[PDB]
From Swiss-Prot, chain A:
Gene: ATP3
Domain of life: Eukaryota
SUPFAM superfamilies: ATP synthase (F1-ATPase), gamma subunit (SSF52943)
Function: Mitochondrial membrane ATP synthase (F(1)F(0) ATP synthase or Complex V) produces ATP from ADP in the presence of a proton gradient across the membrane which is generated by electron transport complexes of the respiratory chain. F-type ATPases consist of two structural domains, F(1) - containing the extramembraneous catalytic core, and F(0) - containing the membrane proton channel, linked together by a central stalk and a peripheral stalk. During catalysis, ATP synthesis in the catalytic domain of F(1) is coupled via a rotary mechanism of the central stalk subunits to proton translocation.
GO MF terms, alphabetically ordered: proton-transporting ATP synthase activity, rotational mechanism
Assigned keywords, A-Z: ATP synthesis, CF(1), Hydrogen ion transport, Ion transport, Membrane, Mitochondrion, Mitochondrion inner membrane, Transit peptide, Transport
Assembly: F-type ATPases have 2 components, CF(1) - the catalytic core - and CF(0) - the membrane proton channel. CF(1) has five subunits: alpha(3), beta(3), gamma(1), delta(1), epsilon(1). CF(0) has three main subunits: a, b and c.
Cellular component per GO, a single term: proton-transporting ATP synthase complex
Subcellular location: Mitochondrion; Mitochondrion inner membrane
Entry-linked PROSITE patterns: ATPASE_GAMMA
Protein name: ATP synthase subunit gamma, mitochondrial
From Swiss-Prot, chain B:
Gene Ontology BP annotations: proton motive force-driven ATP synthesis; proton motive force-driven mitochondrial ATP synthesis
Assembly description: F-type ATPases have 2 components, CF(1) - the catalytic core - and CF(0) - the membrane proton channel. CF(1) has five subunits: alpha(3), beta(3), gamma(1), delta(1), epsilon(1). CF(0) has three main subunits: a, b and c.
GO function term, MF aspect, one: proton-transporting ATP synthase activity, rotational mechanism
Keyword check for Metal-binding: no
Function in brief: Mitochondrial membrane ATP synthase (F(1)F(0) ATP synthase or Complex V) produces ATP from ADP in the presence of a proton gradient across the membrane which is generated by electron transport complexes of the respiratory chain. F-type ATPases consist of two structural domains, F(1) - containing the extramembraneous catalytic core, and F(0) - containing the membrane proton channel, linked together by a central stalk and a peripheral stalk. During catalysis, ATP synthesis in the catalytic domain of F(1) is coupled via a rotary mechanism of the central stalk subunits to proton translocation.
Pfam families documented for this protein: ATP-synt_Eps (PF04627)
Originating gene: ATP15
UniProt main location, coarse: mitochondrion
CDD domains: F1-ATPase_epsilon (cd12153)
Segments traversing the membrane: none
Domain of life assignment: Eukaryota
Lineage, opening ranks: Eukaryota, Fungi, Dikarya, Ascomycota, Saccharomycotina
SUPFAM superfamilies for this protein: Epsilon subunit of mitochondrial F1F0-ATP synthase
Protein name per Swiss-Prot or TrEMBL: ATP synthase subunit epsilon, mitochondrial
InterPro entries reported in the protein's UniProt record: ATP_synth_F1_esu_mt, ATP_synth_F1_esu_sf_mt
Swiss-Prot record, chain C:
Span of the entire protein shown here: 291 to 418 of 545
Impact noted for substituting G1D: In ATP1-2; growth-defect
Subunit structure, interactors included: F-type ATPases have 2 components, CF(1) - the catalytic core - and CF(0) - the membrane proton channel. CF(1) has five subunits: alpha(3), beta(3), gamma(1), delta(1), epsilon(1). CF(0) has three main subunits: a, b and c.
Compartments, as annotated in UniProt: Mitochondrion inner membrane
Organism of origin: Saccharomyces cerevisiae (strain ATCC 204508 / S288c)
Biological role stated in the UniProt entry: Mitochondrial membrane ATP synthase (F(1)F(0) ATP synthase or Complex V) produces ATP from ADP in the presence of a proton gradient across the membrane which is generated by electron transport complexes of the respiratory chain. F-type ATPases consist of two structural domains, F(1) - containing the extramembraneous catalytic core, and F(0) - containing the membrane proton channel, linked together by a central stalk and a peripheral stalk. During catalysis, ATP synthesis in the catalytic domain of F(1) is coupled via a rotary mechanism of the central stalk subunits to proton translocation.
Top-level lineage group: Eukaryota
Recorded name of the encoding gene: ATP1
UniProt site (Required for activity): S117
Further comment found in the protein's record: Present with 41500 molecules/cell in log phase SD medium.
Family: Belongs to the ATPase alpha/beta chains family.
Name of the protein: ATP synthase subunit alpha, mitochondrial
Amino acid sequence: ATLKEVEMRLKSIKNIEKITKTMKIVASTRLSKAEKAKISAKKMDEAEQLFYKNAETKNLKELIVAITSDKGLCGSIHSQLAKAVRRHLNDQPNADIVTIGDKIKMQLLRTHPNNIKLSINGIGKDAPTFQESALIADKLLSVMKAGTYPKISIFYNDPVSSLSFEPSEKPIFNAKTIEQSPSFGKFEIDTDANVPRDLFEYTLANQMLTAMAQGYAAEISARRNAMDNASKNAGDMINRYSILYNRTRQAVITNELVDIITGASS
Amino acid sequence: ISYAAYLNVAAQAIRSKTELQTASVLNRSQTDAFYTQYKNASEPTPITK
Amino acid sequence: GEWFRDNGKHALIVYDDLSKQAVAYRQLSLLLRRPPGREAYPGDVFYLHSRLLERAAKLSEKEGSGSLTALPVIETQGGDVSAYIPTNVISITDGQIFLEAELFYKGIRPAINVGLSVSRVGSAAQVK
């Protein structure tokens, strides 16, 4: 209503516009570095998960690892993966949930709080790495006793393209399941070492990465979209408040001027 | 110690002059990751990974 | 109200509201042709309230300890507490209670803006 009201509530939106715009380009560079980190993850999946495709490994209490991130301001990344885990957890209500990222721990803590036994923090700043992947995977084995569940499921977001993403699930098979797979014999594995045991702990770490890298790239492409739409909409308010200002500024001056003219007749 | 964590420590000798060591090598090496255990709302202290 | 104060009793006076008073004062003065001031108010529209509200007091022992407590009311437009009369009166009083429509509809009643309201007298006049 007043010039001061309009000057300070325009200014703040001029900032948000400049700001949300900066993080549209911030998370554009961050997309180039996370398309190469994605491809190197996805290419590596075909090579690792091919053995299982050929050995024909299938399943026979459940650990659910859910992956989004710590950050917000990224469309509906966290909201529609939590939506997936819920439709899944509806069928199997008796499962232990491990969360990677706070924005999915909260989404889930409000819906099935007691199923969550572990949370991973500080997760979506840089790209994901095998070190985070493996050290998350190591605690999984240690504190959750990962190696022992009949079924282990990673929930994550697959980048369909640049402009969208798909909430996806994948299984991890333990040592027992690998060994006792229909076409395991096709491969001449030396049964001395624990090739299945190692193959499991490696694939726990490895396919988590596969998931994190995609979810993360799904996110970086939801963030540069939500911010793209934010700048486009913040600029719409700057159009309203530029005009209202140019108005309220003139009105102020005219009304002080009427006061002055009245005071100057008498 | 576990086959993943075991190959990782091996991935940090081969990672740690500063030549054949681009920016993302010393960023493959750093983790801002803190694991919080949870029971019935939270339970115990958040520890470094 | 002064009769009570001046005789060792205690009056509370509610001036509801000083906005409407200033407006009359403006009407009275323009029709007398006294040259107008800000927003057409009279040059001394501040004195109008300053001398009114100074009368509210707590007298000494020598004067029988009578009090006049004033609770003037002001009405703003679109929460504009920077407007002319409200600025005058805020200058004068020992603090204010700010009421907000925003807070009223959130359920908060009285709709007091706790961060903006103060009492300069403070704890000094509050049952321990």
